[PDB]
Design a protein around this nucleic acid. Sequence first.
DNA 1: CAGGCCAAA
DNA 2: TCGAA
DNA 3: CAGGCCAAA
DNA 4: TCGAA
DNA 5: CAGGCCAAA
Lengths: 429, 429, 54
Amino acid sequence: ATAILRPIGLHVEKFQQTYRKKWRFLTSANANVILAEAASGERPARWALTTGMASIPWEYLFFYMSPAEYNRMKNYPGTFAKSASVRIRTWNTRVAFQTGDTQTANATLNQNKFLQVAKGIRSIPFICSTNRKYTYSDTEPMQPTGFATLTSYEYRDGLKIAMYGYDNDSADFAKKPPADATGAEIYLQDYLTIYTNDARATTGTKILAGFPPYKNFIEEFDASACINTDVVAMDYDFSYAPLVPQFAPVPNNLITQNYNASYPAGTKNEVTAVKTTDSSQATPPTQVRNAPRKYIQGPNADTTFFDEEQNYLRVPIEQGGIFEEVNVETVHDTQMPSINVGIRAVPKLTTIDETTQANSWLDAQGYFEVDCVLTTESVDPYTYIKGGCYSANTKSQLQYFASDGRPIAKVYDNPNVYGRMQMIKTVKP
Amino acid sequence: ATAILRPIGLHVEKFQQTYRKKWRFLTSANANVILAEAASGERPARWALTTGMASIPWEYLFFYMSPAEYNRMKNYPGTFAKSASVRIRTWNTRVAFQTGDTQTANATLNQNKFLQVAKGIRSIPFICSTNRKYTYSDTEPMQPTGFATLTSYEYRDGLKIAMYGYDNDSADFAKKPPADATGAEIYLQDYLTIYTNDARATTGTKILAGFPPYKNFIEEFDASACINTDVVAMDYDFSYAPLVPQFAPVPNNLITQNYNASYPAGTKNEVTAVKTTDSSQATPPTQVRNAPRKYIQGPNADTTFFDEEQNYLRVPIEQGGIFEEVNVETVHDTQMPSINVGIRAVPKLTTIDETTQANSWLDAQGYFEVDCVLTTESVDPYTYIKGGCYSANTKSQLQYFASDGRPIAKVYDNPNVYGRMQMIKTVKP
Amino acid sequence: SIPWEYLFFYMSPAEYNRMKNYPGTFAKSASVRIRTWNTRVAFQTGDTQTANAT
DNA sequence: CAGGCCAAA
DNA sequence: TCGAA
DNA sequence: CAGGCCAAA
DNA sequence: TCGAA
DNA sequence: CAGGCCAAA
């Protein structure tokens, strides 16, 4: 029999977008030295071991998309980041012909140059590491002598301004010609740092294990043979990266009496849980279901995380485990692999009278060409005939919140805890 | 070596039973009109859109089995419903030659007849719908003008009495000759109804989305070409449909000191949880393990749900997620697909002076032949030598209970919440 | 008249309201297909003096 | 040799 | 399977 | 085109 | 796998 | 025919 109607279902429009950037980065070949970091609050006294492996911030949205693209993206509710890709090529590595010292005839045409690549060091459970900005000595510019006070947020903000420039009405407009326009090189300042405990003032039983042998977890190549070659190629598929919240549904409490109904979940976990661990071992690991949560669209929505533009440069793109959907969901913890690349410090051609590492270095600089692609997807659903887009309420989203109203998000800036990236309260910009 | 004994194990007898019925149903081709339903308690003011798609109650035990079969089934502890099957055939659709109005010469031999089939509309998250019994206007018998106060329980009870008749000593015996004996046609009165919010008195922000386009989720066929053809064929395998509780085990507290022992569950969920959601979004979704439960056989058993015969016509056959077994179990939420079939209203042959739908209709009637089969299974276990059947205590069953002692069961009469069938307290008959 | 020349013939108020968020929108093509069903003709007219039913 | 541990695969 | 095979 | 969401498969 | 493949 | 139940596989 002829069918005059068939179940065609909803009209839903899906939109895929792609964002590409090309960056050229300059890195300094820092010496590996030990710096003391004094105790401060809950931070214990510790030793820090510096490197020249600059952090590549491929985990953040500004790395892939301009302020104009970001501003336009807010007009597409339900936008999810789907995949991110990065390719790193190295160019010729420059090493100074001589050092500043005049007493030694240290100039030499012969060079030994080495390129260092570290993938996924951030997640190694027994290596405590972060990316830090150093201060350097005036006589030895390759030698860190302390820590800059710049935060990770401020570092990424400065990188973003270098990439995309100021507003046309800024008094400081001329200070940063946008590399997205010129294609000029940008200096990176955030370097992989390895920590270990400082037991000088420790009372009772001391842990005297020294350092982890972190060189056993990096790749090091002859830089003379890597000119104009790819050294890193990484692809990442996001688990849950909601960049713009979904369209709100038509609220069923306006239509139904049973809007606050209950139903079986069986043995399935449909509400996520928060895991807390304690490496001091004063308390055992705990798992708590039904964390404080807020809807991010709809009647009582709290959109602070998206209103504050946290996901542009302050927090990583991947946020799996931080958000919930009201359906029968399966959620796991997430983290993107870290990327650090750089040039090993080049010792100055001179004699020393002891069996030690070098104490003076030649100026050396890495030149890295970075390609990056980000793909996203958004939806325009029409559940109802009038009044714009509305999604099914099974698409409704929630976000972890703290009791003071601050949204909670994943952060990659702190060292891993049991190989995990912690989630912390966001800070208002 | 010759074995004089081998581990033959327990003697367990398994019994399979099959229940068949054939029903012939008459449906009215109701007009699609909008009725206002005023606010009442937690029920908000809403608009209702009527249809002629009659509900087919294939989710209930009385649809498949007579009172004699049901009464006998209570003698088989551990009876589970295994599968249910329904087949629907349509016969010739009757449309009135003319309407009651005399002023218009509206009689015509030409007809356009359409059959509507809706499968699984009940579970669609963005469509708020139930089955309702209407009141109709006297001048337009196809036109609903209000809602009857009959409950779903009373509707199904009346259907059951029509199918199987009264007791031989009833004063009303002659009023309902049983269709199970005569094979005569029965009129159905419960029709699919689509709701949307009524914002006439809403203060603040209004939702003005109108209706969902529900026609995009049904199949509609030329009824002139469907005579004597199958239109619906559905099969359902039950997850957990306990019709009679299992034989009680020999209680180990009479034999052992460690009857209240504890043991690891590991990371597996062995006790089910209740999920509560809130479409008003005042609270986030919550999941609670270890709900109030009662054993349904054994020492402290509460058999109220089965003593009250709730599963015959008041609650659906499928109850997965409502019951637990003491073993290492895996449980998920359940619901059977809904079935609604009917004839579209046939406009009267007349002119109207505006661009609207028809306001007058011809009497029209659907004729549906329904075959239904239900298969069940029960067990007689002999764990012990004397005193009748006893099961292993790993077969012990529990049911969700409310704090006032009412058993909790799934219900299909309310609109879905996030695509789920809610569980509510049962009501004493 | 079949008003296939107008936007409301093809798109709902919700779709129209959402479409305003896409600057540079152009309508590219429009298609219409018309099927006829059974034509109904009255058995008789209202006049009683003539036996006109057929 | 990267993504919820690696000494598991 | 909220990577994905 | 139905059974715990569909815009996922 | 308390559908079931 | 044993290892988180057996009347499930």
